[PDB]
PDB file of C-alpha atoms and ligand atoms in Angstrom:
ATOM      1  CA  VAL A   1       0.000   0.000   0.000  1.00  0.00           C
ATOM      2  CA  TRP A   2       1.577   3.229  -1.227  1.00  0.00           C
ATOM      3  CA  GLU A   3       1.704   6.254   1.069  1.00  0.00           C
ATOM      4  CA  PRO A   4       3.302   9.680   0.579  1.00  0.00           C
ATOM      5  CA  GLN A   5       6.682  10.579   2.008  1.00  0.00           C
ATOM      6  CA  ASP A   6       6.824  12.782   5.130  1.00  0.00           C
ATOM      7  CA  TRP A   7       3.029  12.980   5.498  1.00  0.00           C
ATOM      8  CA  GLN A   8       3.141  12.544   9.293  1.00  0.00           C
ATOM      9  CA  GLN A   9       5.474  15.514   9.784  1.00  0.00           C
ATOM     10  CA  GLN A  10       3.581  17.555   7.185  1.00  0.00           C
ATOM     11  CA  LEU A  11       0.343  17.067   9.125  1.00  0.00           C
ATOM     12  CA  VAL A  12       2.168  17.990  12.343  1.00  0.00           C
ATOM     13  CA  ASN A  13       3.275  21.248  10.713  1.00  0.00           C
ATOM     14  CA  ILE A  14      -0.256  22.024   9.501  1.00  0.00           C
ATOM     15  CA  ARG A  15      -1.468  21.441  13.064  1.00  0.00           C
ATOM     16  CA  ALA A  16       1.109  23.957  14.334  1.00  0.00           C
ATOM     17  CA  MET A  17       0.268  26.589  11.695  1.00  0.00           C
ATOM     18  CA  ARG A  18      -3.447  26.858  12.515  1.00  0.00           C
ATOM     19  CA  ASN A  19      -4.695  30.151  13.931  1.00  0.00           C
ATOM     20  CA  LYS A  20      -6.304  30.934  17.293  1.00  0.00           C
ATOM     21  CA  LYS A  21      -9.690  29.491  18.253  1.00  0.00           C
ATOM     22  CA  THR A  22     -20.076  28.017  20.539  1.00  0.00           C
ATOM     23  CA  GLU A  23     -22.233  24.889  20.653  1.00  0.00           C
ATOM     24  CA  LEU A  24     -25.898  25.586  19.971  1.00  0.00           C
ATOM     25  CA  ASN A  25     -28.925  24.291  21.866  1.00  0.00           C
ATOM     26  CA  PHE A  26     -31.013  21.628  20.122  1.00  0.00           C
ATOM     27  CA  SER A  27     -34.378  20.456  21.434  1.00  0.00           C
ATOM     28  CA  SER A  28     -33.570  16.837  20.528  1.00  0.00           C
ATOM     29  CA  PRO A  29     -30.853  14.833  18.753  1.00  0.00           C
ATOM     30  CA  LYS A  30     -33.261  14.334  15.839  1.00  0.00           C
ATOM     31  CA  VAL A  31     -33.797  18.069  15.339  1.00  0.00           C
ATOM     32  CA  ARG A  32     -30.030  18.563  15.664  1.00  0.00           C
ATOM     33  CA  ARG A  33     -29.414  16.195  12.743  1.00  0.00           C
ATOM     34  CA  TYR A  34     -31.740  18.246  10.535  1.00  0.00           C
ATOM     35  CA  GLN A  35     -30.065  21.514  11.533  1.00  0.00           C
ATOM     36  CA  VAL A  36     -26.621  19.978  10.958  1.00  0.00           C
ATOM     37  CA  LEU A  37     -27.649  19.041   7.415  1.00  0.00           C
ATOM     38  CA  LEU A  38     -29.164  22.476   6.780  1.00  0.00           C
ATOM     39  CA  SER A  39     -26.024  24.335   7.869  1.00  0.00           C
ATOM     40  CA  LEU A  40     -23.947  22.202   5.493  1.00  0.00           C
ATOM     41  CA  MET A  41     -26.354  23.073   2.665  1.00  0.00           C
ATOM     42  CA  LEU A  42     -26.083  26.809   3.455  1.00  0.00           C
ATOM     43  CA  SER A  43     -22.297  27.172   3.727  1.00  0.00           C
ATOM     44  CA  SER A  44     -21.458  27.021  -0.001  1.00  0.00           C
ATOM     45  CA  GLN A  45     -19.475  30.118  -1.053  1.00  0.00           C
ATOM     46  CA  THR A  46     -20.331  31.790   2.242  1.00  0.00           C
ATOM     47  CA  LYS A  47     -18.315  33.078   5.177  1.00  0.00           C
ATOM     48  CA  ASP A  48     -19.024  31.142   8.360  1.00  0.00           C
ATOM     49  CA  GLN A  49     -20.506  34.162  10.149  1.00  0.00           C
ATOM     50  CA  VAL A  50     -22.966  34.780   7.310  1.00  0.00           C
ATOM     51  CA  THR A  51     -24.031  31.127   7.470  1.00  0.00           C
ATOM     52  CA  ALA A  52     -24.362  31.346  11.262  1.00  0.00           C
ATOM     53  CA  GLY A  53     -26.516  34.451  10.864  1.00  0.00           C
ATOM     54  CA  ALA A  54     -28.867  32.598   8.528  1.00  0.00           C
ATOM     55  CA  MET A  55     -28.971  29.642  10.923  1.00  0.00           C
ATOM     56  CA  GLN A  56     -29.720  32.019  13.797  1.00  0.00           C
ATOM     57  CA  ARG A  57     -32.583  33.681  11.912  1.00  0.00           C
ATOM     58  CA  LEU A  58     -34.029  30.273  11.012  1.00  0.00           C
ATOM     59  CA  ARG A  59     -33.795  28.999  14.596  1.00  0.00           C
ATOM     60  CA  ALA A  60     -35.464  32.173  15.897  1.00  0.00           C
ATOM     61  CA  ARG A  61     -38.585  31.216  13.925  1.00  0.00           C
ATOM     62  CA  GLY A  62     -38.340  27.510  14.754  1.00  0.00           C
ATOM     63  CA  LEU A  63     -36.055  25.332  12.621  1.00  0.00           C
ATOM     64  CA  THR A  64     -37.752  21.980  12.013  1.00  0.00           C
ATOM     65  CA  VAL A  65     -38.705  20.032   8.894  1.00  0.00           C
ATOM     66  CA  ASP A  66     -42.374  20.983   9.264  1.00  0.00           C
ATOM     67  CA  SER A  67     -41.810  24.679   9.996  1.00  0.00           C
ATOM     68  CA  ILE A  68     -39.539  24.906   6.943  1.00  0.00           C
ATOM     69  CA  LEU A  69     -42.219  23.340   4.735  1.00  0.00           C
ATOM     70  CA  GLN A  70     -44.702  25.869   6.172  1.00  0.00           C
ATOM     71  CA  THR A  71     -42.353  28.722   5.186  1.00  0.00           C
ATOM     72  CA  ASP A  72     -42.980  30.016   1.674  1.00  0.00           C
ATOM     73  CA  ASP A  73     -40.072  30.480  -0.724  1.00  0.00           C
ATOM     74  CA  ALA A  74     -40.060  34.285  -0.544  1.00  0.00           C
ATOM     75  CA  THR A  75     -39.904  34.240   3.259  1.00  0.00           C
ATOM     76  CA  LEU A  76     -37.208  31.548   3.302  1.00  0.00           C
ATOM     77  CA  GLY A  77     -35.175  33.591   0.822  1.00  0.00           C
ATOM     78  CA  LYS A  78     -35.289  36.696   3.012  1.00  0.00           C
ATOM     79  CA  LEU A  79     -34.255  34.584   6.014  1.00  0.00           C
ATOM     80  CA  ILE A  80     -31.126  33.029   4.481  1.00  0.00           C
ATOM     81  CA  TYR A  81     -30.049  36.036   2.423  1.00  0.00           C
ATOM     82  CA  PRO A  82     -27.247  36.903   1.870  1.00  0.00           C
ATOM     83  CA  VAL A  83     -25.731  33.401   1.769  1.00  0.00           C
ATOM     84  CA  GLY A  84     -24.126  32.631  -1.572  1.00  0.00           C
ATOM     85  CA  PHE A  85     -26.434  31.137  -4.216  1.00  0.00           C
ATOM     86  CA  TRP A  86     -29.363  31.785  -1.886  1.00  0.00           C
ATOM     87  CA  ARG A  87     -32.065  31.340  -4.552  1.00  0.00           C
ATOM     88  CA  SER A  88     -30.784  27.854  -5.382  1.00  0.00           C
ATOM     89  CA  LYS A  89     -30.423  26.998  -1.690  1.00  0.00           C
ATOM     90  CA  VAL A  90     -34.084  27.904  -1.101  1.00  0.00           C
ATOM     91  CA  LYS A  91     -35.027  25.319  -3.728  1.00  0.00           C
ATOM     92  CA  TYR A  92     -32.621  22.720  -2.312  1.00  0.00           C
ATOM     93  CA  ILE A  93     -33.806  23.122   1.283  1.00  0.00           C
ATOM     94  CA  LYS A  94     -37.512  23.025   0.403  1.00  0.00           C
ATOM     95  CA  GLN A  95     -37.228  19.978  -1.864  1.00  0.00           C
ATOM     96  CA  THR A  96     -34.921  18.101   0.516  1.00  0.00           C
ATOM     97  CA  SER A  97     -37.174  18.884   3.487  1.00  0.00           C
ATOM     98  CA  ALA A  98     -40.155  17.490   1.571  1.00  0.00           C
ATOM     99  CA  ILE A  99     -38.197  14.287   0.905  1.00  0.00           C
ATOM    100  CA  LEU A 100     -37.281  13.929   4.590  1.00  0.00           C
ATOM    101  CA  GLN A 101     -40.900  14.499   5.631  1.00  0.00           C
ATOM    102  CA  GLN A 102     -42.334  11.971   3.169  1.00  0.00           C
ATOM    103  CA  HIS A 103     -39.721   9.205   3.207  1.00  0.00           C
ATOM    104  CA  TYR A 104     -37.546   9.547   6.337  1.00  0.00           C
ATOM    105  CA  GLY A 105     -40.017  10.374   9.117  1.00  0.00           C
ATOM    106  CA  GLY A 106     -38.626  13.892   9.395  1.00  0.00           C
ATOM    107  CA  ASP A 107     -35.090  12.558   9.954  1.00  0.00           C
ATOM    108  CA  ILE A 108     -32.037  12.789   7.695  1.00  0.00           C
ATOM    109  CA  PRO A 109     -30.684   9.756   5.788  1.00  0.00           C
ATOM    110  CA  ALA A 110     -27.918   7.633   7.294  1.00  0.00           C
ATOM    111  CA  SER A 111     -25.931   6.611   4.208  1.00  0.00           C
ATOM    112  CA  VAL A 112     -23.799   8.538   1.733  1.00  0.00           C
ATOM    113  CA  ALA A 113     -25.644   7.170  -1.305  1.00  0.00           C
ATOM    114  CA  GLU A 114     -28.995   8.407   0.012  1.00  0.00           C
ATOM    115  CA  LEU A 115     -27.625  11.790   1.125  1.00  0.00           C
ATOM    116  CA  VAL A 116     -26.008  12.640  -2.229  1.00  0.00           C
ATOM    117  CA  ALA A 117     -29.327  11.908  -3.961  1.00  0.00           C
ATOM    118  CA  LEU A 118     -30.915  14.851  -2.071  1.00  0.00           C
ATOM    119  CA  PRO A 119     -31.197  18.209  -3.881  1.00  0.00           C
ATOM    120  CA  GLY A 120     -28.064  20.276  -3.370  1.00  0.00           C
ATOM    121  CA  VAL A 121     -26.221  17.680  -1.249  1.00  0.00           C
ATOM    122  CA  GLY A 122     -22.892  16.489  -2.620  1.00  0.00           C
ATOM    123  CA  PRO A 123     -20.441  13.811  -1.475  1.00  0.00           C
ATOM    124  CA  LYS A 124     -18.444  16.334   0.578  1.00  0.00           C
ATOM    125  CA  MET A 125     -21.504  17.380   2.589  1.00  0.00           C
ATOM    126  CA  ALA A 126     -22.593  13.747   2.907  1.00  0.00           C
ATOM    127  CA  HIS A 127     -19.394  12.575   4.605  1.00  0.00           C
ATOM    128  CA  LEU A 128     -19.484  15.589   6.933  1.00  0.00           C
ATOM    129  CA  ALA A 129     -23.148  14.907   7.720  1.00  0.00           C
ATOM    130  CA  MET A 130     -22.421  11.255   8.511  1.00  0.00           C
ATOM    131  CA  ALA A 131     -19.648  12.281  10.912  1.00  0.00           C
ATOM    132  CA  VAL A 132     -21.373  15.212  12.620  1.00  0.00           C
ATOM    133  CA  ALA A 133     -25.003  13.997  12.696  1.00  0.00           C
ATOM    134  CA  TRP A 134     -24.524  10.224  13.076  1.00  0.00           C
ATOM    135  CA  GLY A 135     -20.982   9.991  14.454  1.00  0.00           C
ATOM    136  CA  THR A 136     -20.028   7.744  11.523  1.00  0.00           C
ATOM    137  CA  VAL A 137     -16.791   7.976   9.526  1.00  0.00           C
ATOM    138  CA  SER A 138     -17.933   7.138   5.992  1.00  0.00           C
ATOM    139  CA  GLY A 139     -15.229   8.882   3.977  1.00  0.00           C
ATOM    140  CA  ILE A 140     -13.074  11.942   3.459  1.00  0.00           C
ATOM    141  CA  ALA A 141     -14.892  15.184   2.637  1.00  0.00           C
ATOM    142  CA  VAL A 142     -12.832  16.643  -0.218  1.00  0.00           C
ATOM    143  CA  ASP A 143     -13.453  20.243  -1.251  1.00  0.00           C
ATOM    144  CA  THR A 144     -11.262  22.435  -3.449  1.00  0.00           C
ATOM    145  CA  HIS A 145      -8.948  23.108  -0.492  1.00  0.00           C
ATOM    146  CA  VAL A 146      -8.305  19.416   0.228  1.00  0.00           C
ATOM    147  CA  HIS A 147      -7.992  18.616  -3.485  1.00  0.00           C
ATOM    148  CA  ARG A 148      -5.428  21.382  -4.043  1.00  0.00           C
ATOM    149  CA  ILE A 149      -3.332  20.730  -0.930  1.00  0.00           C
ATOM    150  CA  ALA A 150      -3.257  16.947  -1.359  1.00  0.00           C
ATOM    151  CA  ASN A 151      -1.911  17.420  -4.887  1.00  0.00           C
ATOM    152  CA  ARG A 152       0.638  20.056  -3.842  1.00  0.00           C
ATOM    153  CA  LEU A 153       1.958  17.765  -1.087  1.00  0.00           C
ATOM    154  CA  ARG A 154       1.767  14.676  -3.360  1.00  0.00           C
ATOM    155  CA  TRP A 155      -0.521  12.826  -0.955  1.00  0.00           C
ATOM    156  CA  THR A 156      -1.977  10.898  -3.917  1.00  0.00           C
ATOM    157  CA  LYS A 157      -0.144   8.075  -5.690  1.00  0.00           C
ATOM    158  CA  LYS A 158      -0.497  10.048  -8.919  1.00  0.00           C
ATOM    159  CA  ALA A 159      -1.837  13.551  -9.457  1.00  0.00           C
ATOM    160  CA  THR A 160      -5.643  13.493  -9.404  1.00  0.00           C
ATOM    161  CA  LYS A 161      -7.938  15.555 -11.613  1.00  0.00           C
ATOM    162  CA  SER A 162     -11.133  15.717  -9.515  1.00  0.00           C
ATOM    163  CA  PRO A 163     -11.955  15.931  -5.786  1.00  0.00           C
ATOM    164  CA  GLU A 164     -13.583  12.488  -5.643  1.00  0.00           C
ATOM    165  CA  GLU A 165     -10.448  11.067  -7.257  1.00  0.00           C
ATOM    166  CA  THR A 166      -8.511  12.701  -4.414  1.00  0.00           C
ATOM    167  CA  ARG A 167     -10.919  11.158  -1.893  1.00  0.00           C
ATOM    168  CA  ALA A 168     -10.357   7.632  -3.210  1.00  0.00           C
ATOM    169  CA  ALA A 169      -6.582   8.138  -3.272  1.00  0.00           C
ATOM    170  CA  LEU A 170      -6.406   9.596   0.245  1.00  0.00           C
ATOM    171  CA  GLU A 171      -8.627   6.879   1.735  1.00  0.00           C
ATOM    172  CA  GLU A 172      -6.210   4.162   0.571  1.00  0.00           C
ATOM    173  CA  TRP A 173      -3.507   5.154   3.079  1.00  0.00           C
ATOM    174  CA  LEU A 174      -4.858   7.789   5.486  1.00  0.00           C
ATOM    175  CA  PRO A 175      -5.706   6.236   8.883  1.00  0.00           C
ATOM    176  CA  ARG A 176      -9.458   6.141   9.389  1.00  0.00           C
ATOM    177  CA  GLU A 177      -9.324   8.068  12.676  1.00  0.00           C
ATOM    178  CA  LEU A 178      -8.092  11.121  10.719  1.00  0.00           C
ATOM    179  CA  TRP A 179     -10.668  11.065   7.898  1.00  0.00           C
ATOM    180  CA  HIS A 180     -13.052  13.548   9.516  1.00  0.00           C
ATOM    181  CA  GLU A 181     -10.420  15.809  11.089  1.00  0.00           C
ATOM    182  CA  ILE A 182      -8.392  16.152   7.881  1.00  0.00           C
ATOM    183  CA  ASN A 183     -11.166  18.204   6.253  1.00  0.00           C
ATOM    184  CA  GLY A 184     -11.246  20.919   8.912  1.00  0.00           C
ATOM    185  CA  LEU A 185      -7.450  21.105   9.038  1.00  0.00           C
ATOM    186  CA  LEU A 186      -6.816  21.372   5.294  1.00  0.00           C
ATOM    187  CA  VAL A 187      -9.694  23.817   4.762  1.00  0.00           C
ATOM    188  CA  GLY A 188      -8.130  26.157   7.304  1.00  0.00           C
ATOM    189  CA  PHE A 189      -4.635  25.489   5.960  1.00  0.00           C
ATOM    190  CA  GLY A 190      -5.763  26.398   2.441  1.00  0.00           C
ATOM    191  CA  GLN A 191      -7.591  29.497   3.682  1.00  0.00           C
ATOM    192  CA  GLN A 192      -4.679  31.107   5.553  1.00  0.00           C
ATOM    193  CA  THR A 193      -1.452  29.598   4.175  1.00  0.00           C
ATOM    194  CA  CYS A 194      -1.710  27.235   1.182  1.00  0.00           C
ATOM    195  CA  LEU A 195      -3.746  29.728  -0.828  1.00  0.00           C
ATOM    196  CA  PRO A 196      -5.296  28.978  -4.243  1.00  0.00           C
ATOM    197  CA  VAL A 197      -2.972  31.524  -5.882  1.00  0.00           C
ATOM    198  CA  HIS A 198       0.375  32.710  -4.511  1.00  0.00           C
ATOM    199  CA  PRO A 199       0.595  30.333  -1.519  1.00  0.00           C
ATOM    200  CA  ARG A 200       2.541  31.705   1.437  1.00  0.00           C
ATOM    201  CA  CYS A 201       5.316  29.125   1.154  1.00  0.00           C
ATOM    202  CA  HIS A 202       7.884  31.489   2.685  1.00  0.00           C
ATOM    203  CA  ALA A 203       5.909  31.407   5.957  1.00  0.00           C
ATOM    204  CA  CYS A 204       4.914  27.720   5.714  1.00  0.00           C
ATOM    205  CA  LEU A 205       6.538  25.073   7.914  1.00  0.00           C
ATOM    206  CA  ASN A 206       6.268  22.560   5.038  1.00  0.00           C
ATOM    207  CA  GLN A 207       8.451  24.418   2.521  1.00  0.00           C
ATOM    208  CA  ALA A 208      11.456  22.118   2.976  1.00  0.00           C
ATOM    209  CA  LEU A 209       9.113  19.107   2.641  1.00  0.00           C
ATOM    210  CA  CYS A 210       6.638  20.316  -0.008  1.00  0.00           C
ATOM    211  CA  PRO A 211       7.163  19.045  -3.581  1.00  0.00           C
ATOM    212  CA  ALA A 212       5.250  22.046  -4.952  1.00  0.00           C
ATOM    213  CA  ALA A 213       7.510  24.518  -3.140  1.00  0.00           C
ATOM    214  CA  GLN A 214      10.645  22.643  -4.230  1.00  0.00           C
ATOM    215  CA  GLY A 215       9.758  22.614  -7.938  1.00  0.00           C
TER     216      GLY A 215
HETATM  217  S1  SF4 B   1       5.152  25.230   1.038  1.00  0.00           S
HETATM  218 FE1  SF4 B   1       3.534  26.345  -0.161  1.00  0.00          FE
HETATM  219  S2  SF4 B   1       2.568  24.761  -1.522  1.00  0.00           S
HETATM  220 FE2  SF4 B   1       3.739  23.660   0.122  1.00  0.00          FE
HETATM  221  S3  SF4 B   1       2.184  23.240   1.764  1.00  0.00           S
HETATM  222 FE3  SF4 B   1       3.225  25.221   2.296  1.00  0.00          FE
HETATM  223  S4  SF4 B   1       1.916  26.879   1.385  1.00  0.00           S
HETATM  224 FE4  SF4 B   1       1.317  24.884   0.407  1.00  0.00          FE
END
Protein backbone atom coordinates (compact mmCIF):
# COMPACT_ATOMS: atom_id res chain seq x y z
CA VAL A 1 0.00 0.00 0.00
CA TRP A 2 1.58 3.23 -1.23
CA GLU A 3 1.70 6.25 1.07
CA PRO A 4 3.30 9.68 0.58
CA GLN A 5 6.68 10.58 2.01
CA ASP A 6 6.82 12.78 5.13
CA TRP A 7 3.03 12.98 5.50
CA GLN A 8 3.14 12.54 9.29
CA GLN A 9 5.47 15.51 9.78
CA GLN A 10 3.58 17.56 7.18
CA LEU A 11 0.34 17.07 9.13
CA VAL A 12 2.17 17.99 12.34
CA ASN A 13 3.27 21.25 10.71
CA ILE A 14 -0.26 22.02 9.50
CA ARG A 15 -1.47 21.44 13.06
CA ALA A 16 1.11 23.96 14.33
CA MET A 17 0.27 26.59 11.70
CA ARG A 18 -3.45 26.86 12.51
CA ASN A 19 -4.70 30.15 13.93
CA LYS A 20 -6.30 30.93 17.29
CA LYS A 21 -9.69 29.49 18.25
CA THR A 22 -20.08 28.02 20.54
CA GLU A 23 -22.23 24.89 20.65
CA LEU A 24 -25.90 25.59 19.97
CA ASN A 25 -28.93 24.29 21.87
CA PHE A 26 -31.01 21.63 20.12
CA SER A 27 -34.38 20.46 21.43
CA SER A 28 -33.57 16.84 20.53
CA PRO A 29 -30.85 14.83 18.75
CA LYS A 30 -33.26 14.33 15.84
CA VAL A 31 -33.80 18.07 15.34
CA ARG A 32 -30.03 18.56 15.66
CA ARG A 33 -29.41 16.20 12.74
CA TYR A 34 -31.74 18.25 10.53
CA GLN A 35 -30.06 21.51 11.53
CA VAL A 36 -26.62 19.98 10.96
CA LEU A 37 -27.65 19.04 7.42
CA LEU A 38 -29.16 22.48 6.78
CA SER A 39 -26.02 24.34 7.87
CA LEU A 40 -23.95 22.20 5.49
CA MET A 41 -26.35 23.07 2.66
CA LEU A 42 -26.08 26.81 3.46
CA SER A 43 -22.30 27.17 3.73
CA SER A 44 -21.46 27.02 0.00
CA GLN A 45 -19.48 30.12 -1.05
CA THR A 46 -20.33 31.79 2.24
CA LYS A 47 -18.31 33.08 5.18
CA ASP A 48 -19.02 31.14 8.36
CA GLN A 49 -20.51 34.16 10.15
CA VAL A 50 -22.97 34.78 7.31
CA THR A 51 -24.03 31.13 7.47
CA ALA A 52 -24.36 31.35 11.26
CA GLY A 53 -26.52 34.45 10.86
CA ALA A 54 -28.87 32.60 8.53
CA MET A 55 -28.97 29.64 10.92
CA GLN A 56 -29.72 32.02 13.80
CA ARG A 57 -32.58 33.68 11.91
CA LEU A 58 -34.03 30.27 11.01
CA ARG A 59 -33.79 29.00 14.60
CA ALA A 60 -35.46 32.17 15.90
CA ARG A 61 -38.59 31.22 13.93
CA GLY A 62 -38.34 27.51 14.75
CA LEU A 63 -36.06 25.33 12.62
CA THR A 64 -37.75 21.98 12.01
CA VAL A 65 -38.70 20.03 8.89
CA ASP A 66 -42.37 20.98 9.26
CA SER A 67 -41.81 24.68 10.00
CA ILE A 68 -39.54 24.91 6.94
CA LEU A 69 -42.22 23.34 4.73
CA GLN A 70 -44.70 25.87 6.17
CA THR A 71 -42.35 28.72 5.19
CA ASP A 72 -42.98 30.02 1.67
CA ASP A 73 -40.07 30.48 -0.72
CA ALA A 74 -40.06 34.29 -0.54
CA THR A 75 -39.90 34.24 3.26
CA LEU A 76 -37.21 31.55 3.30
CA GLY A 77 -35.17 33.59 0.82
CA LYS A 78 -35.29 36.70 3.01
CA LEU A 79 -34.25 34.58 6.01
CA ILE A 80 -31.13 33.03 4.48
CA TYR A 81 -30.05 36.04 2.42
CA PRO A 82 -27.25 36.90 1.87
CA VAL A 83 -25.73 33.40 1.77
CA GLY A 84 -24.13 32.63 -1.57
CA PHE A 85 -26.43 31.14 -4.22
CA TRP A 86 -29.36 31.78 -1.89
CA ARG A 87 -32.06 31.34 -4.55
CA SER A 88 -30.78 27.85 -5.38
CA LYS A 89 -30.42 27.00 -1.69
CA VAL A 90 -34.08 27.90 -1.10
CA LYS A 91 -35.03 25.32 -3.73
CA TYR A 92 -32.62 22.72 -2.31
CA ILE A 93 -33.81 23.12 1.28
CA LYS A 94 -37.51 23.03 0.40
CA GLN A 95 -37.23 19.98 -1.86
CA THR A 96 -34.92 18.10 0.52
CA SER A 97 -37.17 18.88 3.49
CA ALA A 98 -40.16 17.49 1.57
CA ILE A 99 -38.20 14.29 0.90
CA LEU A 100 -37.28 13.93 4.59
CA GLN A 101 -40.90 14.50 5.63
CA GLN A 102 -42.33 11.97 3.17
CA HIS A 103 -39.72 9.20 3.21
CA TYR A 104 -37.55 9.55 6.34
CA GLY A 105 -40.02 10.37 9.12
CA GLY A 106 -38.63 13.89 9.40
CA ASP A 107 -35.09 12.56 9.95
CA ILE A 108 -32.04 12.79 7.69
CA PRO A 109 -30.68 9.76 5.79
CA ALA A 110 -27.92 7.63 7.29
CA SER A 111 -25.93 6.61 4.21
CA VAL A 112 -23.80 8.54 1.73
CA ALA A 113 -25.64 7.17 -1.31
CA GLU A 114 -29.00 8.41 0.01
CA LEU A 115 -27.62 11.79 1.13
CA VAL A 116 -26.01 12.64 -2.23
CA ALA A 117 -29.33 11.91 -3.96
CA LEU A 118 -30.92 14.85 -2.07
CA PRO A 119 -31.20 18.21 -3.88
CA GLY A 120 -28.06 20.28 -3.37
CA VAL A 121 -26.22 17.68 -1.25
CA GLY A 122 -22.89 16.49 -2.62
CA PRO A 123 -20.44 13.81 -1.47
CA LYS A 124 -18.44 16.33 0.58
CA MET A 125 -21.50 17.38 2.59
CA ALA A 126 -22.59 13.75 2.91
CA HIS A 127 -19.39 12.58 4.61
CA LEU A 128 -19.48 15.59 6.93
CA ALA A 129 -23.15 14.91 7.72
CA MET A 130 -22.42 11.25 8.51
CA ALA A 131 -19.65 12.28 10.91
CA VAL A 132 -21.37 15.21 12.62
CA ALA A 133 -25.00 14.00 12.70
CA TRP A 134 -24.52 10.22 13.08
CA GLY A 135 -20.98 9.99 14.45
CA THR A 136 -20.03 7.74 11.52
CA VAL A 137 -16.79 7.98 9.53
CA SER A 138 -17.93 7.14 5.99
CA GLY A 139 -15.23 8.88 3.98
CA ILE A 140 -13.07 11.94 3.46
CA ALA A 141 -14.89 15.18 2.64
CA VAL A 142 -12.83 16.64 -0.22
CA ASP A 143 -13.45 20.24 -1.25
CA THR A 144 -11.26 22.43 -3.45
CA HIS A 145 -8.95 23.11 -0.49
CA VAL A 146 -8.31 19.42 0.23
CA HIS A 147 -7.99 18.62 -3.49
CA ARG A 148 -5.43 21.38 -4.04
CA ILE A 149 -3.33 20.73 -0.93
CA ALA A 150 -3.26 16.95 -1.36
CA ASN A 151 -1.91 17.42 -4.89
CA ARG A 152 0.64 20.06 -3.84
CA LEU A 153 1.96 17.76 -1.09
CA ARG A 154 1.77 14.68 -3.36
CA TRP A 155 -0.52 12.83 -0.95
CA THR A 156 -1.98 10.90 -3.92
CA LYS A 157 -0.14 8.08 -5.69
CA LYS A 158 -0.50 10.05 -8.92
CA ALA A 159 -1.84 13.55 -9.46
CA THR A 160 -5.64 13.49 -9.40
CA LYS A 161 -7.94 15.56 -11.61
CA SER A 162 -11.13 15.72 -9.51
CA PRO A 163 -11.96 15.93 -5.79
CA GLU A 164 -13.58 12.49 -5.64
CA GLU A 165 -10.45 11.07 -7.26
CA THR A 166 -8.51 12.70 -4.41
CA ARG A 167 -10.92 11.16 -1.89
CA ALA A 168 -10.36 7.63 -3.21
CA ALA A 169 -6.58 8.14 -3.27
CA LEU A 170 -6.41 9.60 0.25
CA GLU A 171 -8.63 6.88 1.73
CA GLU A 172 -6.21 4.16 0.57
CA TRP A 173 -3.51 5.15 3.08
CA LEU A 174 -4.86 7.79 5.49
CA PRO A 175 -5.71 6.24 8.88
CA ARG A 176 -9.46 6.14 9.39
CA GLU A 177 -9.32 8.07 12.68
CA LEU A 178 -8.09 11.12 10.72
CA TRP A 179 -10.67 11.06 7.90
CA HIS A 180 -13.05 13.55 9.52
CA GLU A 181 -10.42 15.81 11.09
CA ILE A 182 -8.39 16.15 7.88
CA ASN A 183 -11.17 18.20 6.25
CA GLY A 184 -11.25 20.92 8.91
CA LEU A 185 -7.45 21.11 9.04
CA LEU A 186 -6.82 21.37 5.29
CA VAL A 187 -9.69 23.82 4.76
CA GLY A 188 -8.13 26.16 7.30
CA PHE A 189 -4.64 25.49 5.96
CA GLY A 190 -5.76 26.40 2.44
CA GLN A 191 -7.59 29.50 3.68
CA GLN A 192 -4.68 31.11 5.55
CA THR A 193 -1.45 29.60 4.18
CA CYS A 194 -1.71 27.24 1.18
CA LEU A 195 -3.75 29.73 -0.83
CA PRO A 196 -5.30 28.98 -4.24
CA VAL A 197 -2.97 31.52 -5.88
CA HIS A 198 0.38 32.71 -4.51
CA PRO A 199 0.59 30.33 -1.52
CA ARG A 200 2.54 31.70 1.44
CA CYS A 201 5.32 29.13 1.15
CA HIS A 202 7.88 31.49 2.69
CA ALA A 203 5.91 31.41 5.96
CA CYS A 204 4.91 27.72 5.71
CA LEU A 205 6.54 25.07 7.91
CA ASN A 206 6.27 22.56 5.04
CA GLN A 207 8.45 24.42 2.52
CA ALA A 208 11.46 22.12 2.98
CA LEU A 209 9.11 19.11 2.64
CA CYS A 210 6.64 20.32 -0.01
CA PRO A 211 7.16 19.05 -3.58
CA ALA A 212 5.25 22.05 -4.95
CA ALA A 213 7.51 24.52 -3.14
CA GLN A 214 10.65 22.64 -4.23
CA GLY A 215 9.76 22.61 -7.94
S1 LIG B 1 5.15 25.23 1.04
FE1 LIG B 1 3.53 26.35 -0.16
S2 LIG B 1 2.57 24.76 -1.52
FE2 LIG B 1 3.74 23.66 0.12
S3 LIG B 1 2.18 23.24 1.76
FE3 LIG B 1 3.22 25.22 2.30
S4 LIG B 1 1.92 26.88 1.38
FE4 LIG B 1 1.32 24.88 0.41
